[PDB]
Design an enzyme around this catalytic site. Structure first.
Site, PDB file in Angstrom:
ATOM      1  N   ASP A  71      37.238  20.014  -1.723  1.00  0.00           N
ATOM      2  CA  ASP A  71      36.905  21.460  -1.964  1.00  0.00           C
ATOM      3  C   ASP A  71      37.469  22.539  -1.008  1.00  0.00           C
ATOM      4  OD1 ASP A  71      34.484  20.668  -3.648  1.00  0.00           O
ATOM      5  OD2 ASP A  71      33.992  19.536  -1.843  1.00  0.00           O
ATOM      6  N   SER A  86      37.726  27.486   1.381  1.00  0.00           N
ATOM      7  CA  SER A  86      36.542  26.755   1.010  1.00  0.00           C
ATOM      8  C   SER A  86      36.076  27.077  -0.252  1.00  0.00           C
ATOM      9  CB  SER A  86      35.368  26.887   1.804  1.00  0.00           C
ATOM     10  OG  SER A  86      34.065  26.605   1.311  1.00  0.00           O
ATOM     11  N   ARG A  87      36.262  26.428  -1.406  1.00  0.00           N
ATOM     12  CA  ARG A  87      35.867  26.429  -2.808  1.00  0.00           C
ATOM     13  C   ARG A  87      34.341  26.711  -2.904  1.00  0.00           C
ATOM     14  NH1 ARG A  87      39.711  24.658  -7.315  1.00  0.00           N
ATOM     15  NH2 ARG A  87      37.716  23.725  -8.196  1.00  0.00           N
ATOM     16  N   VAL A  88      33.659  26.134  -1.967  1.00  0.00           N
ATOM     17  CA  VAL A  88      32.029  26.408  -2.079  1.00  0.00           C
ATOM     18  C   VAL A  88      31.786  27.894  -1.487  1.00  0.00           C
ATOM     19  CG1 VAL A  88      29.937  25.703  -1.109  1.00  0.00           C
ATOM     20  CG2 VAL A  88      31.441  23.970  -1.596  1.00  0.00           C
TER      21      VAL A  88
END
Ligand SMILES: Nc1ncnc2c1ncn2[C@@H]1O[C@H](COP(=O)(O)OP(=O)(O)NP(=O)(O)O)[C@@H](O)[C@H]1O
Ligand SMILES: Nc1ncnc2c1ncn2[C@@H]1O[C@H](COP(=O)(O)OP(=O)(O)NP(=O)(O)O)[C@@H](O)[C@H]1O
Ligand SMILES: [Mg+2]
Ligand SMILES: [Mg+2]
Lengths: 482, 468, 483
Positions: free
Chosen positions: A324, A349-351
């Site tokens: 992620d 961070s893709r979150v």
């Protein structure tokens, strides 16, 4: 017998080719006459290919081999906390038997599309740079990646160290249990690490899985899958585990060893055609479960070692596309002084925000920028610079220095946001660059002496109300003036 | 019922033995009942001596030599028709959303012959999307393939959701979204986002069907899902005569999956490690996506470029089928333009007078030439001043700055997040709207009247609010 | 259970069927399987024959019957194929019924030797201003079309096949040029749309399409060009002239490497097999101009190659460059700029064309070739001085540049080309605005069509210019400019 037993046709390079075992399951564990074990990876017509768990001086042609009737599995449960086990969960720390809640297989299907919930709770690493700019949530798979000797283990370790805040609490839903998977490190290194965790009272909530450098390849290849089941015990019972695979480069290498020896078709860099599936199978097991399913969580920090920065290498590519996001470290930034040596430009961070304490998000919103533009203009730090572009150079310098951090010294969120508030809004611009160190230091102790209440409100409510921003704006200017 | 025995297990490779001439054909699905569900194998080779070589669709831990395999007497099959809408489906056509079985009309096989040369439509044509930037500048080909670029931070999943909505409302066509090597956390995301946005309605009428072949599925499953999902889209063209959308995210993971399977089957890898069958593999997917006389499947496929090397076989092969591109760029979304389409990076093969008409072309062309002159004037504005420009060039920066804000559009599905009601702008509108500005009919209009609006009648209307 | 005209499949996989028996089979003999799919006997060993499948592996199973044909891979040829579209094996795919064939040539046929040939002297007039003035193609020649993807490669082939509308309508047999378009690895949709254009311009009646599209069994793609060659050859062998377009060889060579790898042939450079050069060389050698003793028939080949990022140094490009008699290189840089045809002058050459280009163009394009290869040079060095002498040559350069932009599907006769070139080379355009040169053309054509039609008639019939006729165009041009 032949159905449940076999004879050794040939043995060499930790592969034993065995006649019989006609009723053996694929990936089943066996036993050799001398007591060494191994697993059946190759079910072929005439024979079975078995990979040895110990030295192959202990197997000979003709020898008798027994089925165990067991797919590789491991003890699991809380009785593993504070323990150092090997890849099969045998205790190596000299503290006696392991008390297991039950047992679980090395290979478990990851949670489906349905039994999950969007990542939304912070794994607080305590690293100013990470928490503010590359925030990690529970259920996330965030890669730590870089060249040798750049601080990769250090980042994971400081995270583990930081969980003390909540692990010394009573609130089970806030605790983050820790699983460190040393794959191919040297024994002394692992011992050194364990000593360090003890020294900072973090051993008590950690589990160390150690398939070191001189252990048979398949143990090194099993270790991450095994450790995953150990961490999965928590997720499955509404708790939260953090798992650090240090590192998946070395695991890939082990898996390759077996494949080349079992004479499986090689591909790029002699890796087997299922080496992506090795890492995806594994890394998909980190997840945040839904309400129905107990809302448990496993968070993964895999480590990858690149060669002279080449993220295009086969295994780096696999893991980078599986996870992620990346925390990306650099030798350059390291020697420059910037430690952690996080490359903000190449990290993500893709979150993202959904994983970040609101209070921090409010101050860190801008920081993402004031640095982005700083990088686009960083080249200009060599005489004739207009007002606008010099200003951005002043902030960038200072904010970079603010993100510098001593090892084994994670900060609390309520310690972090003041510091970033000061930086971001310009309260540091006056203070000369070599003193931003002592600045952070005193500013916190002055805040504890005289403004303990604001810190407490930050810590407990996590947000910043308009009133708090004002209280923070005043507290900062107050201290800056002296 | 035709039974065999497993003679060999090697990772995802399973060897199975039958009785003479009673062998399953290559590409047929074989089944093994397991404790949990059912392991499916797809026949890849006949080795000889009545054995066949198969690729597993799930893990092979615990299989035993001599276990009963069943022949299904055909390729993997999937439920088709309206019953799939709103459902999540894996590679082998099972529902994976805990809503019981897909009570569908028929099941078609996932391996299908493409349409005949005779069956092929002879004229290229535009699929009208209602999205201004797309329709004016990089129009999609009805029955073609569109490459979509850019990851998170650019509103990909809203853009993808918007196209499902528009296509259905404006042309009465359903969509299929295939997740190829889909990150499970992000599949869980998308499903929940589709419900929030209306494109899935567990009670109402759902406009999209979901098929996921997740990253943790083995190479066999990942290679085949694009087909599974495609077949679903195919039936809507073949039986309902619709203009279907097909979504592949991500096509590169389709190619890597094939790469992995070929390697596993012992084939000598070709250049840069890819399969020797890279191009025919790509054909056997893509050639099925096309206009027929009944309708069309139009596929929007997310394209990832390895090493950022445009000439890497994977992209190089894929690009040989792409009729157009839509580039979503952080450089656009940082200026507050939604969608975040790059008006110059996105190109079309169909942007041609003989396909769109001489008028349409001429508007789009100068729209594109104006934005270029603006781009090469950004550097002198940053250092010198706004006043250092010629009579005609100080007018055309003022013009572009407007054109630019006019290319943004409020989306209908994003209303739950925005509060702004959504516009679906007809193609004829879009051409006329921009034609009118290019002649300079609206220089009197302030710049903010172009932001987040549909037709030119919405520019006339909004400008009057920001005054009176 | 005949094991001499018949065999049983032992094993099938990777596009290869292994068959027991077929004792009396020939090397490269076609076979027919239970299911109807066909194959080629590639390698004959003791105990078995290896057969390359001309369809999906699905269609063959272990145990099935395999039947001899007593036919080395061959195709229907003749004049009955004009107006049809067939697949690699010559199977009718336009849905128009059984192919009316005069006979059946083998797919592999040896090229004419040293003696049966003669130097090119007859032109293939493309109708493209840039091509015919700069890189002229002779009948019997092999010229390569090469450039990046999406650079108008096809449009040069296409506007050539279109341009033959002029001659294939008349009685004159020797001047008729039948066309053979070979689609290899392309999309079905594209080829269908292309055929749509050939009919729209009537051109379909004299052309033959052979297609192995993108999803078809690799060996059918490997085969296409060869069988298309056979078909093209009938016209060469019988005294007429055929044009053959291989769109494109790159994709063919890709199809070829697939088989070789699946057959386990050692990969070499870029993983292509050692004989990939031979693949192409044997093909393009069949393009020839025949001697007096053999009917004087001509096969002309226009292979298309796709470069990656304009790199002409790659293995396959340099291979085909080293087989053809020149190449028209299309630069992606010019194509994006608007300059189309996007011919790169320096990088383009015809090796034999000059001695076959119509003499009329030859005179008015005096050193046009060597000049444009030098304006382009001084242009890059311009962006230190606003110099005087080189400044006028730059205006000449730009006016000749803008003069060579040409629309697609708009091919011009030689008589329309000659005056256009006269007006540029002799500086009659240097007083005109840059953005008006395109309008000048058809207005200058309008003028020549409704006034000086008598000069235009002359050029067509002679193929030359007399001293008298040269001074005639001189006057005609100059009058037009000032109005
Ligand atoms: N934040 C920090 N500040 C100062 N020093 C640090 C920091 N982090 C790590 N170091 C030191 O840098 C060195 C390398 O750190 P380490 O965490 O081992 O990186 P690594 O990538 O794991 N190296 P290796 O495992 O040997 O490939 C050690 O001497 C650490 O003590
Ligand atoms: N002279 C021209 N002027 C303007 N457009 C043209 C011209 N020639 C071709 N085109 C168009 O430009 C596009 C690409 O040219 P095309 O003839 O397809 O070249 P290509 O190299 O075969 N491309 P591809 O086959 O996809 O690699 C097509 O849409 C053509 O119709
Ligand atoms: Mg380390
Ligand atoms: Mg082409």
């Amino acid at each position: 017998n032949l159905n449940e037993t076999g004879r050794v046709l040939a043995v060499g390079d930790g592969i034993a080719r065995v006649f019989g075992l006609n009723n053996i399951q694929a990936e089943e564990l066996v036993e050799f006459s001398s007591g060494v074990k191994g697993m059946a990876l190759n079910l072929e017509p005439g024979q079975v290919g078995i990979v040895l768990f110990g030295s192959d001086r202990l197997v000979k042609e003709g020898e008798l081999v027994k089925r165990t009737g067991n797919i590789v599995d491991v003890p699991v449960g809380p009785g593993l906390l504070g323990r150092v086990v090997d890849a099969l969960g045998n205790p190596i720390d000299g503290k006696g038997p392991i008390d297991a809640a039950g047992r679980s297989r090395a290979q478990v299907k990851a949670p489906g599309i349905l039994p999950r919930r969007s990542v939304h709770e912070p794994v607080q690493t305590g690293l100013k740079a990470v928490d503010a700019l590359v925030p990690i949530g529970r259920g996330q798979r965030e890669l730590i990646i870089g060249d040798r000797q750049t601080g990769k283990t250090a980042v994971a370790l400081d995270t583990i160290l930081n969980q003390k805040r909540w692990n010394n609490g009573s609130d089970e839903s806030k605790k983050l249990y820790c699983v460190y998977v040393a794959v191919g490190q040297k024994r002394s290194t692992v011992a050194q690490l364990v000593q360090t965790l003890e020294q900072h009272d973090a051993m008590k909530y950690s589990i160390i899985v150690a398939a070191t450098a001189s252990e048979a390849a398949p143990l090194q290849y099993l270790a991450p899958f095994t450790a995953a089941s150990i961490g999965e015990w928590f997720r499955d019972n509404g708790k939260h585990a953090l798992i650090v695979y240090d590192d998946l480069s070395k695991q890939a290498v082990a898996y390759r060893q077996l494949s080349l020896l079992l004479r499986r078709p090689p591909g790029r860099e002699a890796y087997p055609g299922d080496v992506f599936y090795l890492h995806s199978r594994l890394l998909e097991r980190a997840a945040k479960l839904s309400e129905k399913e107990g809302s448990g969580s496993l968070t993964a920090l895999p480590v990858i070692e690149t060669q002279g920065g080449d993220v295009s290498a086969y295994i780096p590519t696999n893991v980078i596309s599986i996870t992620d996001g990346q925390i990306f470290l650099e030798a350059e930034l390291f020697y420059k002084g910037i430690r952690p040596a996080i490359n903000v430009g190449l990290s993500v961070s893709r979150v993202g925000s959904a994983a970040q304490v609101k209070a921090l998000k409010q101050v860190a919103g801008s920081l993402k920028l004031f640095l982005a533009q700083y990088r686009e203009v960083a080249a200009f730090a060599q005489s004739d610079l207009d007002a606008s572009t010099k200003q951005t150079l002043v902030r960038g310098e200072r904010l970079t220095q603010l993100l510098k951090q001593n090892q084994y010294s994670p900060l609390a969120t309520e310690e972090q946001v003041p510091l970033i508030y000061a930086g971001v809004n310009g309260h540091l611009d006056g203070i000369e660059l070599s003193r931003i160190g002592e600045f952070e230091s005193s500013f916190l102790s002055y805040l504890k002496s005289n403004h303990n209440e604001l810190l407490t409100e930050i810590r407990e409510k996590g947000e910043l109300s308009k009133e708090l921003l004002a209280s923070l704006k005043s507290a900062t200017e107050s201290f800056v003036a002296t | 019922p035709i039974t065999g025995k497993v003679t060999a297990v090697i990772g995802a490779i399973v060897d199975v033995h039958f009785e003479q001439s009673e062998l399953p054909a290559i590409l047929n699905a074989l089944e093994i009942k397991t404790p949990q569900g059912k392991l499916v194998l797809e026949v890849a080779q006949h080795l000889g001596e009545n054995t066949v070589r198969t690729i597993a669709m799930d893990g092979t831990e615990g299989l035993v030599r001599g276990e009963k395999v069943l022949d299904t007497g055909g390729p993997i099959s999937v439920p088709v028709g309206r019953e799939t809408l709103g459902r999540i489906i894996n590679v082998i056509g099972e529902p994976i959303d805990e809503r019981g079985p897909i009570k569908s009309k028929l099941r078609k096989p996932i391996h299908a012959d493409p349409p005949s040369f005779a069956e092929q439509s002879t004229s290229a044509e535009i699929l009208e999307t209602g999205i201004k930037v797309v329709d004016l500048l990089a129009p999609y080909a009805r029955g073609g393939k569109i490459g979509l670029f850019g990851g998170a931070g650019v509103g990909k999943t809203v853009f993808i959701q918007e196209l499902i909505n528009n296509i259905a409302k404006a042309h009465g066509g359903f969509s299929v979204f295939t997740g190829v090597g889909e990150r499970t956390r992000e599949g869980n995301d998308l499903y929940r986002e589709m419900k929030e946005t209306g494109v899935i309605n567990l009670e109402g009428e759902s406009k999209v069907a979901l098929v996921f072949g997740q990253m943790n599925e083995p190479p066999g499953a990942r290679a085949r899902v694009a087909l599974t999902g495609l077949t679903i889209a195919e039936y809507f063209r073949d039986e309902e005569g619709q203009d279907v959308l097909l979504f592949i995210d991500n096509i590169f993971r389709f190619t890597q999956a094939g790469s992995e399977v070929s390697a596993l089957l012992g084939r000598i890898p070709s250049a840069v490690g890819y399969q020797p069958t890279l191009a025919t593999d790509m054909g056997l997917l893509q050639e099925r996506i096309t206009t027929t006389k009944k309708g069309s499947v139009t596929s929007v496929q997310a394209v990832y470029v390895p090493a950022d090397d445009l000439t890497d076989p994977a992209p190089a092969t894929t690009f040989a089928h792409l009729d157009a591109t839509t580039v979503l760029s952080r450089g656009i979304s940082e200026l507050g333009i939604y969608p975040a389409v790059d008006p110059l990076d996105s190109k079309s093969r169909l942007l041609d007078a003989a396909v769109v008409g001489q008028e349409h072309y001429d508007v789009a062309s100068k729209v594109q030439e104006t934005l270029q002159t603006y781009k090469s004037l950004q550097d002198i504005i940053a250092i010198l001043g706004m006043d250092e420009l010629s009579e005609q060039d100080k007018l055309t920066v003022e013009r572009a700055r407007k054109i630019q804000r006019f290319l943004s559009q409020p989306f209908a599905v994003a209303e739950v997040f925005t509060g702004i009601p959504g516009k679906l702008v007809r193609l004829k509108d879009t051409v006329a709207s921009f034609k009118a500005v290019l002649e300079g009919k609206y220089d009197n209009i302030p710049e903010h009247a172009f932001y987040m609006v549909g037709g030119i009648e919405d520019v006339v209307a909004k400008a009057e609010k920001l005054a009176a």
